[PDB]
Design a protein around this nucleic acid. Structure first.
Ligand SMILES: [Zn+2]
Lengths: 52, 52, 97, 50, 133, 88, 84, 122, 50
RNA sequence: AAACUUUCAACAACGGAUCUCUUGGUUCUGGCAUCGAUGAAGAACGCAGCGAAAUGCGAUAAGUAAUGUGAAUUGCAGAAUUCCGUGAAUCAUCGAAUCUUUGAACGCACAUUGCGCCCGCCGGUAUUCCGGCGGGCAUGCCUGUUCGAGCGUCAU
RNA sequence: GUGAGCCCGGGUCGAACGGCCUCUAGUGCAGAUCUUGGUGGUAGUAGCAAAUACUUCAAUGAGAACUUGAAGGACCGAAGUGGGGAAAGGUUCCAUGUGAACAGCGGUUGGACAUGGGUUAGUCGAUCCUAAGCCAUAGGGAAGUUCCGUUUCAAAGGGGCAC
RNA sequence: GAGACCGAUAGCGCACAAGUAGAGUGAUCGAAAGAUGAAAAGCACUUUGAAAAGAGGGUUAAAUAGCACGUGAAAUUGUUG
RNA sequence: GGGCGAGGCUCCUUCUGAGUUCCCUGGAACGGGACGCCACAGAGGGUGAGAGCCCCGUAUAGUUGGAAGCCAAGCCUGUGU
């Protein structure tokens, strides 16, 4: 599916001292919050070069 | 209260002097019907209600 | 010369349904033939000459026969489309051939 | 509060009736997957949001 | 090989239909063959099984045991046969699940619906044999 | 003091329950639901939130009348009873 | 419960004057008198006519509200309108 | 007892159906109190009484709606619940006669020149 | 059967008892990586905490 | 020498990888045209002998009628089925019905189970009082009916 | 076998799998302050030290510093550590029972867990009135979702009498 | 109806009471989580414990499958050598 | 201009072939060996392990019962206001 791995709202937390700059799922109160997104290396993300 | 007293009169031939009502925390209505002094509520409960 | 500077991926059309559409068209043609039996499935078409100097060496099928053609052939214009003859009123006969 | 509307009290009544553990005969059914009440509510843990 | 476009050879769809079939379909699925002498008597190979039938078990560890069908538990596709049971730890008797395809029916619980079933199956078999003959 | 001590003054309610969509999103002063747009006649939906559209799209609820329409279409919206059926 | 208002029950509901009856039935005076004679609607007398109407005199005619309600369903009203 | 079958109900008319409904409701009223006082093989009876009340109401409604349809068989305007449902678009759709109406010139032209049955020799 | 049902009800609680929940109504998910503690930089101006 | 630290091995732990599975996704293809004031989609509240949810249903409430099938349901309890039958079933089909409060939502409102009006019926001593039940009362627009207004144009 | 790797023995285990030639790819990891999950050393370590304070006997119980009764000692000190309410919460209230979990110890106790019970009005509030203000209608804008408008450039209704 | 697609960190966010639990005033955000066994045959009875449980002794083809449940890697840990 | 209309088509419905033969392993044959049979059916699934013949289905002609439509070879009649 063309929308697989992209049905999330996520932004990176910026350059800092603790974590990497992958986009992280915003919000709170669940395990998904703060987790990585949108990357082919990320769990529950879009693959590299999706098949058409 | 009028519906409750008329229903009691139609069902069990019960005449009441007054009726108090509340709504329980479960959502059902509770009605205290005080009967006339001529009729005995214990005889009504034993015979018609069967609450012994 | 690659015209891929728009949002081209939103209107890419593939043709996986080409044999299925051929099957559907053949089924529709068979149903039309069964409904129109014993008449032919198509109407009679005139022979006309293509316009411009590139294609005026070749003839082909036109839309319908002219009113003058039907009058000379002796077929009334109200009878003609009811017996499988296509009729065109816009076309005229500028020559006798 | 003690002052409450009828709609609020009715929804609180529904929440009070829903606040229970599952019956014990449920776990003995054939092919059951329900082990506990996963929507159980407590007055100190999760708000009703009224 | 299947030819009809309304027939699906999908294993996923077949397993979903089998394990989510309703009770009236499970009755047809839970069919058993008849015995030999019943087969020449009625010209019927197979019938759906029901309570009160007499069966002989021909497969499994309880082979060659005979008894009456005490229960048709369609919810896990099981028949309970009389005396084909086991004991628990406590020694209480619990019936042993047998699939109906592992038994053969030796005596039919006959009511007029079963007579109509057998008669129409026999008539259909004879008219197919006559048409193909 | 903009944090923990300021959080102790939060005992009012901007939103109450909406009679139409059932959410705690009816603004108590504007009398406008932030979720479904009540009391406007149309239900509030936008094309910039596919998730919000599909959270309330047709089929998420009960389909108390619409689910029986295809059967009536399949039988042709027929009217009457089977012939010889018991009744009046 | 809620306190009742004065003049909303009793003789005020029980009676109405001839003017109020005519305006309620939407008839002319000859048609109203004709219908009252034909249907047997008789004049009445309240115990206190001020409780029915403050502008009532000794010559004011009173009728029953239920009698005017019964007159509202008489099929001769449509006959009168058809003849007009 | 407590199970009333529809085969007996389809032969009655309205007054004894009302009497049966009243008796069933009275039995359900006393046996709800008997339910809150004791139990046993008894709850099947109140389930049967509930289903019997449903059956009696269904039979009464069906017979009286049939009588109303017989009354409104030959009238121009029917009650909305007795009118056919279909869909809203189907009810707003043009009737068959109005959709099949043609002009007089079209009628003359179709009378004198219809689509003929013909074949062409090969 | 009553003892078996009680045993099944008790074995239903092992995972949440290992998770140390106060009953089955305890389903609170806490922030183990808060954004205010794991993002941003501290400058010489105003700080976000003391 | 032991203890301790480290290395190797066996077993036991911790943990859930690997392998196998799959009533699920994803993509393609074929067929069809059918929501709603005759009250939709959605929301809320209820309904089972013993259910919180999911599922189904609406005070006829895990359901009614009708047609078909033909002996179940099942976790427990309790009843079956004249089995040679107007008939089990958490069965299928589905043309007759029921369908609470709402919602475009429609008497006026609604952060209230608030306040009305019109017409019938029934009950309580009741021409007046009290109570219950039933049927109604939104807006815009069209065709028609009826009642009207205006030296606006006339006749008389 | 130079090698990436391949093959066999032994143990474990339970339902599928491989060789060769072609075809095909979402095909080979130590890093990316990766991504998810799991686990160490630190380490039985830092602490668990505001709000003056606890002690004796008996009972219960497997087990009592933090359960109860009695006996003593203290504290809040009437702008209270008291008796009641508004907001907010929603059953936390009461009785009985209780394994584990939670009460950063312990627990026989508990706002925890389990089953039940409990909120009675013509006079107390809501309901009624209007305030600051908000929304219909007439009508005028706006492509429109709708904006203004609240007394207007509206035929916006009450009463009486009648031979 | 199908596939030279994916095989539970994959494939839709969702194979499970998933647009659920949960968070946010709100617009919105939004998971984790499938597999005992062919059949519960889910351990009678004895004994030790307050209990959880332990040990005998059965059930199973297998408990080296005990509702922490197919297979059971590594990090890390205990015992023995 | 009217009215019949044989016949045909569409949709639901009853029904369809053949081993549970013998031996071995196994907890259980659906495994191995032997002897057969059906096939316009050797697609798929279930059944205690890889089942054409155990069960549901699968192929093909049809064959029971029912409703509503459409097409249609032909045949009766009026005749020109
Ligand atoms: Zn809303």
């Amino acid at each position: 599916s063309e929308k697989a791995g992209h049905q999330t709202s996520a932004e990176s937390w910026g350059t800092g001292r603790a974590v990497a700059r992958i986009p992280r799922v915003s919000g709170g109160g669940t395990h998904r919050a703060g987790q990585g997104a949108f990357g082919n290396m990320c769990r529950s993300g879009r693959m590299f070069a999706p098949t058409k | 209260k009028a519906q409750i007293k008329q229903a009691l009169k139609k069902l069990y031939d019960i005449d009441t002097v007054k009726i108090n009502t509340l709504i329980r925390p479960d959502g059902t209505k509770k009605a205290f019907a005080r009967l006339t002094p001529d009729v005995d509520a214990l005889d009504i409960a034993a015979t018609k209600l069967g609450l012994v | 010369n690659n015209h891929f500077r728009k949002h081209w991926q939103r209107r890419v059309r593939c043709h996986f349904d080409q044999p299925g559409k051929k099957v559907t068209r053949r089924l529709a043609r068979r149903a039309k033939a069964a409904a129109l039996a014993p008449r032919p499935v198509d109407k009679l078409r005139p022979i006309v000459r293509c316009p411009t100097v590139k294609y005026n060496r070749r003839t082909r099928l036109g839309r319908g026969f002219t009113l003058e053609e039907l009058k000379a052939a002796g077929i009334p214009r109200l009878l003609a489309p009811t017996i499988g003859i296509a009729v065109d009123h816009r076309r005229k006969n500028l020559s006798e051939e | 509060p003690s002052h409450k509307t009828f709609r609020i009290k009715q929804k609180l009544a529904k929440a009070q009736k829903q606040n229970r553990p599952i019956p014990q005969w449920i776990r003995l059914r054939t092919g059951n997957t329900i082990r506990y009440n996963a929507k159980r509510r407590h007055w100190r843990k999760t708000r009703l949001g009224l | 090989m299947k030819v009809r476009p309304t027939v699906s050879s999908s294993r996923r769809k077949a397993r979903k239909a089998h394990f989510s079939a309703p009770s009236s379909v499970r009755r047809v699925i839970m069919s058993a063959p008849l015995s030999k002498e019943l087969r020449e008597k009625y010209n019927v190979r197979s019938i759906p099984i029901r309570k009160g039938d007499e069966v002989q078990i021909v497969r499994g560890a309880h082979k060659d045991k005979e008894g009456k069908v005490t229960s048709v538990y369609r919810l896990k596709y099981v028949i309970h046969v009389e005396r084909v049971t086991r004991e628990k730890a406590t020694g209480q008797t619990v019936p042993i699940g047998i699939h109906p395809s592992n038994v053969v029916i030796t005596k039919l619980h006959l009511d007029k619906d079963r007579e109509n079933i057998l008669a129409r199956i026999k008539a259909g078999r004879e008219q197919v044999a006559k048409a193909k003959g | 003091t903009k944090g923990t001590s300021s959080f102790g003054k939060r005992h009012n309610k901007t939103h109450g329950l909406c009679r139409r969509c059932g959410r705690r999103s009816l603004h108590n002063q504007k009398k406008v639901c932030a979720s479904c747009g009540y009391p406007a006649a149309k239900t509030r939906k936008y094309n910039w939130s596919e998730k919000a559209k599909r959270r309330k799209v047709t089929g998420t609820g009960r389909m108390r009348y619409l689910s029986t329409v295809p059967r009536r279409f399949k039988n042709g919206f027929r009217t009457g009873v089977p012939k010889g059926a018991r009744g009046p | 419960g809620k306190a009742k208002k004065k003049g909303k029950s009793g003789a005020a509901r029980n009676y109405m004057t001839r003017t109020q009856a005519v305006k309620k039935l939407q008839l002319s005076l000859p048609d109203f008198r004709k219908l009252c004679i034909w249907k047997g609607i008789y004049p009445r007398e309240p115990r206190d006519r001020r409780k029915v109407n403050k502008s009532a005199t000794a010559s004011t005619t009173f009728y029953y509200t239920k009698d005017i309600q019964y007159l509202l369903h008489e099929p001769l009203l449509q006959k009168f309108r058809e003849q007009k | 007892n407590g199970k009333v079958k529809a085969g007996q109900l389809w032969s009655k008319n309205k007054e004894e159906l009302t009497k049966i409904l009243g008796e069933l409701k009275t039995e359900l009223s006393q046996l709800r109190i008997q339910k809150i006082s004791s139990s046993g093989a008894k709850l099947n009876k109140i389930h049967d009484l509930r289903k019997s009340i449903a059956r009696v109401l269904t039979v009464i409604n069906a017979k009286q709606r049939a009588q109303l349809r017989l009354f409104y068989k030959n009238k121009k305007y029917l009650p909305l619940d007795l009118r056919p449902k279909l869909t809203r678009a189907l009810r707003r759709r043009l009737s068959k006669e109005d959709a099949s109406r043609v002009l007089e010139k079209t009628k003359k032209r179709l009378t004198h020149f219809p689509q003929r049955k013909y074949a062409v020799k090969a | 059967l009553r003892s078996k049902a009680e045993r099944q009800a008790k074995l239903a609680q092992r995972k949440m008892n290992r998770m140390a929940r106060q009953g089955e109504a305890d389903r609170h998910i806490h922030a183990s990586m808060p954004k205010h503690l794991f993002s941003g930089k501290r400058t010489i101006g105003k700080t976000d905490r003391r």
